[PDB]
Amino acid sequence: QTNKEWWNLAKNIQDVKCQQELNRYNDLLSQAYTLSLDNTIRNLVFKAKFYSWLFVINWFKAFPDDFHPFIPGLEMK
Amino acid sequence: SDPFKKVERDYHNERSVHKHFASYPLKFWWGLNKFETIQGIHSILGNAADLVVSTLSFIPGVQGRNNASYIENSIRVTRFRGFDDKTQ
C-alpha cells in the first residue's frame, strides 16, 4: 500500500536501517501525497475544505512524529 | 548652481514630477526602516559613530554630543518613533 513517488524517494534514501532514522525523513516522505488537482473554482473550494478538515482531523488524532501509521516506511521499503 | 531659482516658488515646478522612474529601484532600500532589526542596526551604528566623534573631539573644531542637551537626545531617540510605511 504505497505509490511510485514514495518508492522512488525510499530507493533514493539508502543506508538507513533504523525506524527512527527513517522517521527523521518523515517530512521528505510526506511529499508522496501529491494530491494533484487543477485550480478550478470548484477544485479550489474543495482543496480549502479538504485541507481544513485534514488539519482538524490531525488535531483530533494528536499522534506524534514517532507514530505515523499513514506514512509508509521501513517495513514496506 | 544658482540656488535662488530653485528657492523661487512656481506653480508648474511645484506640481511637476520630482521623482522619476530611475530613482525608485535606487531608493527603495529606504523602506527597510520599517523593520525593528534594521532600526536597531542603524541606532547601534549611529551610537558608535557618536562615541567615536566624542573620543576624537579633543581636536579643535570637532564637538561630540552632550547628554545634557534635550534636543540631541530627543532627535536621536524619536527618529524611528511612529514610523509607518503605509502612510505617505
Partner: protein, 113 residues
C-alpha cells in the same frame, strides 16, 4: 580553615566537572545514562550526515542528466571545498563556465539550426 574550605569547594567542583565530562566511560551511574546520552548524540550526528547524503542522492536521481554534472560539482564543493582554503573557487567557477559554454552552444544550435 578558610584555605581548607576553599580547597574542599574546589575538589567538589573538579569532581563534578570530571563526572559531567567523562561519566560515559564507566558504569558508576546505574543504567549508564551518560553513556546512552553520548550514544544518542553520536547517532543523531551520523543520522544528520546520512540525511544530507540521502537528500543529495534523491536530488541527483531526480536531476536531469544534462546538469547532473553541475549538480555533482556543486554537491562536492559544498561538502568538501567550502571549508578548505587550498580549494580555489575559481577553478569550480571555470568548470561551471565550461558547462555553460556547452549549454550555450547547444542553445544557439537549436536557435539557428
Amino acid at each position: 580553615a578558610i584555605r581548607n574550605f576553599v580547597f574542599k569547594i574546589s575538589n567538589q567542583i573538579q569532581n563534578l566537572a570530571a563526572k559531567r565530562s567523562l561519566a560515559y566511560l564507566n558504569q558508576i551511574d546505574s543504567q549508564s545514562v551518560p553513556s546512552r546520552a553520548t550514544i544518542n548524540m553520536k547517532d543523531q550526528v551520523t543520522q544528520m550526515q546520512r540525511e544530507i547524503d540521502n537528500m543529495a542522492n534523491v536530488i541527483r536521481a531526480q536531476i536531469p542528466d544534462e546538469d547532473r554534472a553541475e549538480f555533482e560539482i556543486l554537491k562536492k564543493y559544498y561538502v568538501t571545498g567550502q571549508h578548505d582554503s587550498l580549494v580555489d573557487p575559481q577553478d569550480v567557477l571555470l568548470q561551471l563556465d565550461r558547462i555553460q559554454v556547452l549549454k550555450n552552444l547547444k542553445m544557439i544550435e537549436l536557435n539557428e539550426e
